Design a protein around this ligand. Structure first.
Ligand SMILES: Nc1ncnc2c1ncn2[C@@H]1O[C@H](COP(=O)(O)OP(=O)(O)O)[C@@H](O)[C@H]1O
Lengths: 385, 796, 49
């Protein structure tokens, strides 16, 4: 029953932004946008964590059938517009509004609630942003190629990271780029990021001090954060136990209560005087800790990225129930031929200075994709024999 | 090349895009001048090394080599360098900053899939700095992402290049004058290839130096003539290409069979490493053995006859070297593999027929279902042509199948001419022998090994420890792969008292013994004593240090040896396994073998101190024979002993000490011997029964069984004149040696009193494991659960 | 005696062998491993596991 709650949690947004169909009105009745939101929601909460694209195709068939079942009063309109397999209502937060850099770069916080379907301006703002990330980080060294599926994956990371009290397990073979994608996805969301470094001596205290700093960023200071554990950031089980309880409770036994909880809480009640607003009169003591756990769990997102293969992943999941339970799950299939030819032309356009031949370039990019798909098979055969 | 090339060209043909016929990848990539320059820098002259050098040249990213032999390490050591190991406290801090801020190139040579994490973020800011790093142990398990960062290159030597390398080294050592002629003509013809290049330079000069008014230069006529002159020396070079490709070639044809054999031998002894760890050794040790063999016996006169003598001697030398490390159950197997790997090239024996020899009824009625399985096994060239009325004659071969030793005297006449030819007739006879009678596989194995390789191989070996000491220089240790109930420690100490004049020092591994071992080793270094490490199978962290210690750098006083002992623990790094001397001291197999060994343990002063040639000489002989019989009884299995017991010599000299006390204090009161003694030998029965040898025995039945053996062998008296059930001695030492000499090699179990048929079961299980060993060296959730699903509705 | 760590047995092997060789010679004074001071002996000792 969790996923039903997640579906509704996604639906409940836009107290009046849904009403504002007037700017778009792209053959849209007010209800049409609503059912499209329902569709996108159901897809992203159910039509994600499935291994083969066929499984996806059958859930979308289910969705279309059920939409026709309930929507027995405009069924032809939904068939014309949103039940069609063509792309519909890509929902996003930063693309739809543009800062416009009037007097300062971040002129105004973009409107945040919704966006519409389009791919061009999506890619143009993505490239814009890529240049920004290049000059923000010294030695960024991030030749990220943005093709349709990559754009969708960044969108999904955004969907999970943004939500209050959310987190998402990301699965996929190495090279799928999830670790690369999350850096941008976090920078856009203003969230700070820190990774764990395994010293020459592999031990436990690093975890504790790092989590303390993380809470105090998401607690006392109250900033927005994110956490980027991966397979490199596990050396034994125990780390998984401590993080497990962090997902569940968030109180570390006597890490914050080593004669410190009261000084840190006392550094916070000034915000409490207006935040809970007890008529600006008084407060209590334990309730401050209640509000503190509220704040830190409200602003400590956890991004986990595991391998799908090996031995340890499956029984690690079985060891700790909350891990696969609370977090959203998303698959990354290997790139299909469309993506590869797209990358080939992105790299051949800038490189077709001397190799001038019409009607042969397109076959060139095609054949290059073919070469890649093939070295996959040769790899398989070598390991097999 | 093959798979990838056919793959890419079929892609191109299906795509219909145009592509050129012919690969010639190396030719239009790099000018051959740099190829030759590298070949001066130690790059192997053959194809695979050529593409490898290209691959390093491209240097898309920093590389990482799979390096079973060491071609890349030497190449980089020479290519432009002419070093700092990974494991060093200074390396992680010092060597990094030096290389990263001044470009020293920081080579590394100890990757074992374990990465100090600080290695990585250095990998991915001086602009004068590169870095090459390589692995040692083959078959890596690199992480996916370690493949993402760095390029991977395999320098797994092929046999093909290997025979050329051995060809060069034999041309060196057999007579240097051959190399003088070789390198002389080779330098000349290399320079003449460069002279063709100079002709090309002259053509280019003729063509574009003037870049106008070529014709008005009437000296162009002279230039044209000059072109002709250069072609003339190429003609001499052309002649030299013939004079080369025959003369040196025949000088090489005298030896390139040898190189072929050498390469074959090496690729045999590779695979035993996969049969079990600790049978691991370099190419370098093999190279020393090869060069030595040339020195040992090669040149007398009559060079072709000496080529044949290579083929005789080298094989035996390398063979014995590997046997010194081998275990009993793997003795027969290594020789068997050597035979096959020899014949997979010359005789062109089919791998399919090999698998026929390893793996495998309506027609016949008399023979057994156990036999009919084998008829269908053989049935599925002329194997599927002569199971008919020919085989089903049933005229004289019934006696044949009854006769023991089917192969030798009653030979099959099914194919008499085929067996006569013998080029493959051995292998045919053996496919027959295995398929019909797996019982007598192993002696047949010894037989055709003796045939195709010589009977010298199928003959006993026993390592003279005094002889073995001559091998051990100070700078190499002596390993010992031991088995339960056997230790040479007493003999090592005995030798250290005989030739060396001092007792050795000993340190047992464990916990908290590193520094103790190190300080005693330093004392040995300065002085020249001997050290006995013990129990290396645990506490392996100290082992890796030893290889660094035993080095030319830290100088060591002469006469210092090291002796190492350990047991079967994988995850034992091969730093010393790659550089050591491996010896095996499990007890000998045969009855005569164990008897002879026992007759070289406590001898020549036990035996020679008598003061009586009559009685207690006979008692020694009795007890020794008893020892050697009851030990060997266990070969059969539960029929002979309920569980295995580890009798050794300790009980023997215990009994000897007792009975010598008994006789000395008996005859201490004897002023005169009636006939040499007046013993009442019934107490000795009870003692050798229940006290000395009673320690191991956990069963009840074994007690009275062993008492019975005592009864039948002692007889309750020293007859002096009778036939042992098995001869009886005279009273001289070398006569005992001869007595051993006339003993048969293989006996029959009625010597123990035990029935002939026992033999049968032993051989079967023995055969059943043997092939399985080599069968490993070759390169679920489905309807089964539905079968169980149907089962569970059948139990009551 | 068996329910004991393996390496401890490894070093105990040394200690007991030293004492055995010491007692064998009938030597009044002997040297013990790991323990620098010299130490004496009395014959009627024994070991059992
Ligand atoms: N979309 C992409 N286009 C090009 N290169 C990529 C892409 N995604 C990943 N890479 C390459 O893979 C490397 C590792 O990416 P990473 O984010 O770790 O993938 P994963 O998380 O699947 O291991 C990066 O350094 C980058 O060079």
């Amino acid at each position: 029953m969790r996923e039903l709650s997640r579906i509704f949690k996604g639906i409940l947004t836009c107290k009046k932004d849904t009403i504002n169909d007037a700017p778009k009105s792209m053959k849209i009745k007010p209800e049409l946008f609503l059912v499209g939101l329902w569709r996108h929601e159901a897809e992203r909460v159910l039509a994600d964590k499935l291994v083969n694209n066929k499984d996806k195709d059958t859930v979308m068939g289910y969705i279309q059938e059920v939409s026709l079942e309930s929507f027995s009063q405009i069924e032809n309109e939904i068939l014309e517009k949103y039940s069609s397999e063509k792309t519909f209502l890509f929902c996003d937060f930063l693309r739809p509004d543009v800062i416009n850099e009037d007097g300062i770069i971040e002129e105004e916080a973009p409107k945040i609630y919704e966006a519409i379907d389009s791919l061009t301006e999506l890619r143009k703002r993505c490239n814009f942003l890529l240049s920004f990330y290049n000059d923000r980080n010294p030695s960024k060294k991030m030749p990220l190629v943005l093709f349709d599926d990559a754009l969708k994956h960044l969108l999904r990371i955004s969907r999970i990271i943004r939500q209050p009290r959310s987190s998402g397990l990301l699965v996929g073979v190495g090279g799928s780029g999830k670790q690369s994608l999350t850096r941008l996805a976090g920078f856009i969301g203003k969230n700070l990021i820190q990774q764990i470094i395994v010293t020459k001596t592999y031990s436990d205290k690093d975890l504790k001090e790092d989590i303390k700093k993380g809470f105090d960023d998401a607690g006392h200071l109250g900033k927005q954060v994110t956490f980027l554990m991966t397979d490199s950031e596990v050396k034994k089980e125990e780390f998984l136990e401590y993080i497990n309880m962090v997902l569940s409770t968030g109180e570390i036994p006597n890490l914050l209560a080593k004669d410190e909880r009261e000084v840190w809480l006392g550094d916070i009640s000034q915000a409490y005087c207006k935040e809970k607003n007890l008529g600006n009169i008084d407060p209590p003591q334990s309730e401050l800790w209640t509000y503190f756990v509220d704040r830190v769990r409200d602003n400590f997102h956890i991004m986990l990225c595991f391998s799908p293969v090996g031995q340890k992943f499956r029984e690690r999941a079985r060891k700790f129930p909350a891990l696969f339970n609370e977090c959203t799950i998303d698959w990354f299939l290997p790139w299909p031929e469309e993506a590869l030819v797209s990358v080939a032309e992105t790299f051949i356009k800038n490189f077709d200075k001397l190799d001038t031949k019409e009607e042969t370039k397109q076959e060139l990019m095609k054949h290059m994709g073919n070469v890649h798909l093939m070295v996959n098979e040769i790899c398989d055969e070598y390991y097999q024999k | 090349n093959k798979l990838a090339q056919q793959r890419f060209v079929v892609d191109m043909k299906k795509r219909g895009v145009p592509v050129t016929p012919g690969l010639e990848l190396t030719s239009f990539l790099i000018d051959d001048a740099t190829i030759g320059e590298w070949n001066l820098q130690g790059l192997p002259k053959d194809d695979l090394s050529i593409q490898n050098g290209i691959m390093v040249t491209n240097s898309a990213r920093y590389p990482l080599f799979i390096d079973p032999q060491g071609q890349g390490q030497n190449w980089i050591r020479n290519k432009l360098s002419a070093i700092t190991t990974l494991s060093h406290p200074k390396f992680k801090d010092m060597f990094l900053k030096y290389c990263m801020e001044s470009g020293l190139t920081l080579i590394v040579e100890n990757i074992e899939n374990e990465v100090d994490p600080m290695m990585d973020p250095v990998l991915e800011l001086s602009k004068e700095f590169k870095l090459f790093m390589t692995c040692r142990l083959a078959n890596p398990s690199f992480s996916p992402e370690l493949s993402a960062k760095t390029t991977i290159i395999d320098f797994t030597v092929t046999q093909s290049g290997l025979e050329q390398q051995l060809l060069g080294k034999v041309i060196s050592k057999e007579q240097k004058a051959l190399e003088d002629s070789l390198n002389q003509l080779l330098a000349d013809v290399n320079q003449n290839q460069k002279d063709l290049q100079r002709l090309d330079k002259n053509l280019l000069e003729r063509l574009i130096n003037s870049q106008g008014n070529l014709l008005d230069d009437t000296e162009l006529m002279d230039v044209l003539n000059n072109t002709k002159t250069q072609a003339k020396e190429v003609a001499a070079k052309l002649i030299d290409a013939e004079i080369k490709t025959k003369e040196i070639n025949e000088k090489r044809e005298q030896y390139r069979p040898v190189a072929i054999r050498g390469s074959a031998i090496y690729f045999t002894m590779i695979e035993v490493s996969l049969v079990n760890w600790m049978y691991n050794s370099s190419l370098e040790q093999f190279l020393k053995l090869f060069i030595e063999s040339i020195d040992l016996s090669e040149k007398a006169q009559l060079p072709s006859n000496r080529v044949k003598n290579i083929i005789s001697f080298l094989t035996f030398h390398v063979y014995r070297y590997v046997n010194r490390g081998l275990f009993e159950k793997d003795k027969i197997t290594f020789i068997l593999m050597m035979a096959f790997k020899i014949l997979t090239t010359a005789g062109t024996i089919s791998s399919g027929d090999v698998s026929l020899f390893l793996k495998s009824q309506k027609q016949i009625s008399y023979l057994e279902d156990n036999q009919w399985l084998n008829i269908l096994a053989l049935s599925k060239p002329f194997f599927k042509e002569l199971p008919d009325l020919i085989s089903r004659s049933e005229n004289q071969w019934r006696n044949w199948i009854d006769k023991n030793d089917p192969e030798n005297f009653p030979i099959p006449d099914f194919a008499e001419s085929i067996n006569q030819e013998k080029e493959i007739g051995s292998f045919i006879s053996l496919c027959l022998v295995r398929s019909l009678r797996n019982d007598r596989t192993l002696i047949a194995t010894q037989n055709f090994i003796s045939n195709v390789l010589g009977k010298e191989f199928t003959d006993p070996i026993s390592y003279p420890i005094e002889g073995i000491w001559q091998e051990s220089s100070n700078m190499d240790p002596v390993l010992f792969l031991l088995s339960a109930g056997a230790d040479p420690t007493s003999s090592i100490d005995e030798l250290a008292k005989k030739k060396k004049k001092f007792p050795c020092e000993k340190v047992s591994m464990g916990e908290g013994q590193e520094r103790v071992a190190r300080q005693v080793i330093m004392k040995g270094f300065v002085e020249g004593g001997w050290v006995i490490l013990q129990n290396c199978h645990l506490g392996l962290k100290f082992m890796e240090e030893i290889e660094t210690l035993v080095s030319p750098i830290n100088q060591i006083h002469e006469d210092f040896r090291l002796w190492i002992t350990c047991e079967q623990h994988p995850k034992f790094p091969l730093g010393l396994l790659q550089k050591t001397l491996k010896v095996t001291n499990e007890p000998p197999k045969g009855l005569k073998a164990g008897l002879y060994k026992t007759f070289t343990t406590i001898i020549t002063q036990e035996f020679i101190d008598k003061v009586d040639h009559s009685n207690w000489r006979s008692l020694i002989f009795t007890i020794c024979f008893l020892h050697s019989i009851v030990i060997e009884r266990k070969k059969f299995g539960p029929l002979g002993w309920c569980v295995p017991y580890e009798y050794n010599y300790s009980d023997l000299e215990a009994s000897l000490l007792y009975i010598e006390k008994y006789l000395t204090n008996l005859m201490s009161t004897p002023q005169p011997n009636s006939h040499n003694l007046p013993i009442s030998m019934n107490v000795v029965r009870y003692m050798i029964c229940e006290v000395q040898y009673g320690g191991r025995i956990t069963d009840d039945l074994d007690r009275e069984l062993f008492i019975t053996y005592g009864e039948t062998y002692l007889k309750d008296g020293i007859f002096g004149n009778d036939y042992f059930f098995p001869q009886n001695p005279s009273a001289e030492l070398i006569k005992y040696q001869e007595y051993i000499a006339k003993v048969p090699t293989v006996d029959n179990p009625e010597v123990f009193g035990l029935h002939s048929n026992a033999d049968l079961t032993f051989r079967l299980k023995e055969s059943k494991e043997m092939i399985n060993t080599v069968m490993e060296t070759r390169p679920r959730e489905e309807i089964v659960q539905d079968k169980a699903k149907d089962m569970l509705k059948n139990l009551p | 005696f068996n329910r004991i760590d393996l390496e401890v047995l490894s070093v105990v092997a040394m200690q007991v062998e030293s004492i055995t060789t010491a007692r064998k010679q009938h030597m009044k004074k002997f040297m013990f491993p790991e323990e620098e001071i010299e130490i004496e002996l009395i014959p009627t000792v024994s070991y059992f596991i």
